[PDB]
Nucleic acid binder design. Structure first.
Lengths: 125, 119, 206, 145, 50
RNA sequence: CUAUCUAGCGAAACCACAGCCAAGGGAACGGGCUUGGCAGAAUCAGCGGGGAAAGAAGACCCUGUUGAGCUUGACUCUAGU
RNA sequence: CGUGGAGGUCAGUGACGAAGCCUAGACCGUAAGGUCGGGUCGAACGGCCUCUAGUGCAGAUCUUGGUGGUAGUAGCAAAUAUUCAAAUGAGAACUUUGAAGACUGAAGUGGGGAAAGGUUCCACGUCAACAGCAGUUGGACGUGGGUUAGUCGAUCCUAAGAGAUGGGGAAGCUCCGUUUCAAAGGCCUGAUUUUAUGCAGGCCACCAUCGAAAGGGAAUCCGGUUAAGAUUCCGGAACCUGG
RNA sequence: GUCGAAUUUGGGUAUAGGGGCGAAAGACUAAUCGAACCAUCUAGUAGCUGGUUCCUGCCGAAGUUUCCCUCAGGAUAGCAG
RNA sequence: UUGACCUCAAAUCAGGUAGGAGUACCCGCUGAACUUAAGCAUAUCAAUAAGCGGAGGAAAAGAAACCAACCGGGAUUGCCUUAGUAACGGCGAGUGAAGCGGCAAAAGCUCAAAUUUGAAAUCUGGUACCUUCGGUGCCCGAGUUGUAAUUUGGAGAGGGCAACUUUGGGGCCGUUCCUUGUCUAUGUUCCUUGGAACAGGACGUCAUAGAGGGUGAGAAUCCCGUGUGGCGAGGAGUGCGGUUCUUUGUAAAGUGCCUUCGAAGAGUCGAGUUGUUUGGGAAUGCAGCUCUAAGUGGGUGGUAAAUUCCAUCUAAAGCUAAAUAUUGGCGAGAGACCGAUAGCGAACAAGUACAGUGAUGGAAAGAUGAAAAGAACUUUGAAAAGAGAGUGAAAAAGUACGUGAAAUUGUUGAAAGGGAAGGGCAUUUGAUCAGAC
RNA sequence: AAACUUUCAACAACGGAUCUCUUGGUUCUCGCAUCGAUGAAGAACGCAGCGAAAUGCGAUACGUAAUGUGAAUUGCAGAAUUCCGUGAAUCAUCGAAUCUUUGAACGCACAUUGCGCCCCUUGGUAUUCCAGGGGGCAUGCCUGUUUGAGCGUCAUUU
């Protein structure tokens, strides 16, 4: 049970906040857990995903398929992965959307701010 | 892309003026070559760059007159505070802290004494 | 207060072969000419609009609240009644169930849970865990989504970390002997709830 | 209209009485708001007890002349009798009534000894002194029933 | 009328710009519900009253 | 020129359920009830006997402690003078 | 008996199919109703003890929506009238072209405008809908193009009128009143060419303003030109006002 | 019928609801006039018309008294549960 | 002649300010009628709706020209209570207060009327500088028809005696409050069904975290959050807790006894009459007229008047938090509320489309699928489309899309039918069927 | 005997009920006090590479500047260096700005996109005429200033 007086247990507001969330806040919403190998190596459990990581699929029909993120389609609350597509009847390939909570990061895209984010959360590099 | 505002601050008013009329020319041939080709999203960058140049120009003359009117009353009305019509008309703290000697003497002599009650 | 009255409709009267209900005037919009103001009309005001002066709270004699709380307290020591409420107390050594005061000074939830199991609350706790269901009606999306049974009521005489030990344990409530809620001591007006007394709590009843 | 054997009733509901209807659904809400402002002031004035020493006063209106009750102020004769100035007493948690006049000695001396007991049990701190903490109580009416 | 004030011709230009069907690509947008132009007006059906 | 027949297009009023009579009785003038006469699919163009046909909660009459327009030495007032 | 919702309990049913819907299939109850089987469907829902109410429909010329018989019926008949052939097309009584026969008959079924409309104008493509038959056509649909002025108007004046101001009423939104018990305004010429206009002067007494695309009023004609504009463009030839 | 004028008519303008305008019909004042239209008071009041929703079980009437600006209504006694 | 005063002007003179919007809640002003009275006119709705003026975060009121008759109380506001009472009232219908007692909150007060006269000491504004919600220097002006100092009835002022006691401002760090940022646990282990596990079964882990939401189905442990704490950033100022600098001041306040005084408000109070208003009765307030005082005076003391007493306050002048109100604005938390004809008129490009000259009037309309994977390709057709093929868990999901009722309709099957049909009891016949063995 | 009519079933229609949902409404509680002549509310017209509307904005026009976060936006096209970054975003925040024409609306007007005057400057051989750019020109009222009017009035003269 929640103890704050500034926290709402309203289903209508929780649904509205997610669906009308701005893009900057959607970045935190689309966070992917790290792998067992990276979790012990960094000390972080989950991070906000970005475009250049490669993840692993642990749920859905695409389980066991590795691939590097192709786009973080924040409008659709989805993440696309290369080499994970469905080929249409007319020889055309379309990406299939994946939710990051069903993905497992296998190596982060290390930048200056992503590194700085690591020490901020207590990561050990 | 476009122009960087922090680069425009270094140049003087004469260099910005040339750049503004330089950008005005450039946007003019973009409009002329847009009517032939189907789409041209580059006109957006030039329009914003002109706006950035104009804005950085504006602050240079606006600060020039703040320093000209620095350290005196009667600032230009567009450079004063825009707090609120009611608040701007509101009495200052000096004019709201004026007190009569009859109360000034009483404040000095007899303030509320901080008292506790245990024993 | 105005819903179903925010128009200017009037009756057309007789001779026009239509019913004498007031009807929206004007023209050109499809809403005009239609019934208004009635408890039968679409878009009217519903019959006897709810007002809030309604009597929500009900005042109960002080002596009766004291009478009923003593009855639901005396009914906690009847294993026949506690079993009827389905509290899984077949393996309890004896009731009332009184434990040493050292339960009152437990901080971690995991310690408090294992304390209840060893005392005999294992079966009752698992019943709450496996009873979680969705609400049947429209109450799901009125912030009443899930439903479960109610487990043991732990009552203390002092609070040194016990109210927050069982704060996250489903079906478990923590209480003080001074307060002794009747809603907790006979849920659904059904007597005989399973209650764990501390040694200090049990002594304070006299 | 009039009917079976019933008392007459005067029910005053022929105005538009439906808009001037109060149902304080706030009874519990106002109570908590009172108890914050009651403590928020108590922090700001920290040592003081949130109220003035009020006197003991015999009620009017022979119906109630038989009991005694808290008054509004200390009847300048009283504050001068106990040896203190009104302008200063108002800074010491004494409520003084410039418009009440003493007329009964047994009532009169009761306020004097009330005010004398008050002076002994209070601690006034210097305007420039250390002002040690003194474990406030929140009511003079409680301390002097 | 032929002779007209600038208010009238200015407000007719507004009504001439707005007279065409829905852009085609808008119905291809994510979470789109607009199926056509519900404010389309023709000179033979309803009058502008300007 | 219609009506008529054809290709195309294509409504509305109205409709408890419906549609053969005689007499009877019956809310004192039945399509239905009783006793009789009778009674054969599906139908077309006409017709104005009937359906007390349709069109309107009778505008006449009366009732209502329901009105309004108007009048006057009605009652009670009032602008102006 | 049934319905929406609430407290309790059946550690109740359920994606191995909840709820709903359909079923001259079965069972229970006097009945309200309850239960089962089969089909369809896809995510929630019940038994029992209690609590609560925006809780049960055949009708109110009930409300909103939907649908019939009537019925392939009434009808699609005012305004003199069509016909032959070719072209196009899947398709021609209706489109285009030609021919023939007719009509409006100059207070026209012709050529221009005012009010009104607003793109209906013109080109290209095009017929799902609209043109109460049709449609290849259209004032429809989709996409575009098109309105060029010193001289034509407005713009100026005033009319019947409207209406600020100085004031006077009115609690007040506002009313009166347009020269009224107003210190009501501005033009010519000088003087100095530290020079702005102070200063020489005289003159003037009316008096805000709005109000007519048919009243009053400075001045442009011809020829040519576009798919669509012209007293406006082009060529030529003019006039007026101001400086 | 009238058809050179008490003629016809456009545009402007004035006159606004117990008010206008009327060669006078209670006519006209936006298909509305013997008091326009719009919103609000307003869910205006009705002794009058119409309707008023599930089952079974048990009981079971009245149209009569007196008073009432009382006679299509109430109060009252009686009948009923 | 020249220089003033009074009064009145002018200027695109220097600096400002009012307007308008919104208006739920407040302060006034104006003001109905519908209705009830079983009619109706006084009465009631109602001192209300509509109309007008004027504010705030609350407003307004507010420190007695009060209440009371007590053993007196002591600003105002609000609650409970007094009380459906005293009283009013075609004494009918009906209306209808306040004192007293408990609680919330509590806070007080200041102007006029006085010669500083051994000294306009005062205040605006202008200009220069400076540490600018401002200070200082200088200069016109306001101002003797009174601007500063001094005191407000509870007092107080001018003198005499005696002596004491008590004091201001500027920097710094914290604290308080507000806004805001960041960090802070535990499975995605195995088997089955399923398109998808978020389901069922086994085994665990965390819990001051089993609120809520998301992800392909009911997820404490997959994600965001949640719980408990930690660490930052920007703002308000004295509300205060410490550090420090200036000594304000040859100043101010309080206090005992004696003496002399003690100014306290006018076209105002008050009275008559009229009207309206009230619960206010031989007149509750208010306002109109006419009359219009006073100083041991005057106002009040709820039956008019004359006479004698007594009680309590100080008007014609003024400021003031909190307790109270709030369908408007902003930001939140909720519900035994409604669920697309319901709930606001409006879940959607709704005050929109649309109607009228106008003022105004005003809808309809949510749901494919987890994912468009929105049907490639062949074939018939002028085309729309059809038939195959395909996607999808499902086209009994094809943008006429969840499910998909009834009225009404087509096709197939069965049966009956001489001017209706439908119904009841009973059985024949045909079809179908449960039980029991 | 067909047809036709009627009844029922299956399948297919018409229609949009029911069932299950819900970024909506409604009601209650809590906290706060903040429009406008330094130009409000409102209105008109415009602005995107491709928008009619809604939403956003104003000729600097789905926006500029500043701060934070830190890699997207997305229907298509395009741009990539801006990706260990003084830096993407239809991001949040927002303290600097722009803010067309109006509007209490203010030079005079307004059913006109009508008509003047003043100040500085530029061009046409120009204080005067025409044009351009920039700044102005409403009313009531208060305080101050300056030029004044009145045998209203004092003093002083000659």
């Amino acid at each position: 049970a929640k103890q704050s007086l500034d926290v709402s247990s309203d289903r209508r507001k929780a649904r509205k906040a997610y669906f009308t969330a701005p893009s900057s806040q959607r970045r935190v919403l689309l966070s992917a857990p790290l792998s067992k190998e990276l979790r012990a190596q960094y000390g972080i459990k989950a991070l906000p995903i970005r475009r250049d990581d490669e993840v692993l699929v642990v749920r859905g029909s695409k389980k066991g398929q590795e691939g590097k993120i192709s786009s973080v389609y924040r409008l659709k609350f989805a993440v696309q992965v290369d080499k994970v597509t469905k080929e249409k009847v007319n020889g055309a390939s379309v990406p299939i959307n994946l939710h990051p909570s069903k993905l497992v990061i296998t190596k982060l895209h290390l930048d200056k701010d992503r590194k700085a984010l690591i020490q901020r959360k207590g990561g050990k590099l | 892309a476009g122009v960087k505002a922090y680069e425009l601050r270094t140049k003087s008013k004469e260099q910005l003026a040339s750049q503004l009329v330089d950008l005005k020319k450039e946007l003019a041939e973009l409009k002329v070559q847009k009517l032939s080709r189907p789409s041209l999203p580059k006109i957006k960058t030039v329009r914003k760059s002109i706006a950035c140049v104009l804005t950085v120009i504006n602050e240079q003359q606006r600060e020039a007159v703040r320093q000209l009117y620095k350290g005196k009353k009667y600032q230009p009305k567009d450079l004063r505070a825009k707090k609120t019509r009611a608040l701007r008309r509101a009495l200052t703290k000096f004019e709201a802290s004026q007190v009569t000697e009859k109360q000034r003497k009483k404040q000095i002599a007899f303030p509320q004494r901080k008292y506790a009650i245990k024993a | 207060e105005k819903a179903g009255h925010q128009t200017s409709a009037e009756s057309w009267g007789t001779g026009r072969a239509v019913a004498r209900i007031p009807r929206v005037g004007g023209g050109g919009t499809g809403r005009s000419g239609q019934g208004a103001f009635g408890n039968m009309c679409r878009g009217g005001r519903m019959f006897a609009p709810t007002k809030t002066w309604r009597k929500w709270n009900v005042k109960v004699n002080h002596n009766e609240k004291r009478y009923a709380t003593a009855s639901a307290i005396a009914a906690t020591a009847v294993a026949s009644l506690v079993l009827a409420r389905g509290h899984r107390v077949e393996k309890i050594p004896e009731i009332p169930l009184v434990v040493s005061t050292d339960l009152e000074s437990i901080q971690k939830t995991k310690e408090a849970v294992a304390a209840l199991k060893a005392v005999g609350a294992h079966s009752d706790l698992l019943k709450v865990l496996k009873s979680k269901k969705l609400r049947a009606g429209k109450g799901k999306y009125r912030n009443r989504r899930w439903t479960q049974r109610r487990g043991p009521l732990v009552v203390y005489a002092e609070d040194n970390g016990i109210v927050k030990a069982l704060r996250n344990v489903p079906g478990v409530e923590t209480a003080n002997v001074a307060s002794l809620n009747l809603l907790q001591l006979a849920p659904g007006a059904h007597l005989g709830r399973f209650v764990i007394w501390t040694e200090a709590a049990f002594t304070k009843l006299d | 209209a009039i009917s079976k054997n019933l008392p007459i009733l005067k029910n005053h509901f022929r105005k538009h009485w439906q808009e001037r209807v109060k149902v304080h659904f706030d009874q519990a809400g106002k109570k908590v708001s009172r108890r914050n402002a009651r403590a928020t002031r108590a922090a700001k004035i920290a040592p003081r007890p949130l109220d003035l020493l009020r006197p003991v006063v015999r009620a009017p209106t022979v119906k109630y002349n038989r009991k005694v009750r808290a008054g509004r102020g200390f009847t300048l004769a009283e504050v001068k009798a106990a040896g203190l100035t009104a302008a200063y007493a108002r800074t010491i948690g004494i409520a003084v009534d410039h418009r009440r006049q003493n007329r009964n000695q047994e009532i009169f001396d009761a306020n004097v000894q009330r005010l004398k007991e008050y002076q002994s049990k209070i601690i006034v701190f210097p305007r420039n002194g250390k002002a040690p903490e003194a474990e406030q109580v929140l009511s003079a009416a409680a301390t002097f029933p | 009328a032929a002779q007209k004030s600038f208010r009238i011709k200015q407000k007719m230009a507004k009504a001439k710009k707005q007279n065409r069907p829905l852009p085609q690509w808008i119905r291809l947008r994510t979470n789109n519900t607009i199926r056509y132009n519900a404010k389309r007006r023709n000179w033979r059906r309803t009058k502008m009253n300007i």
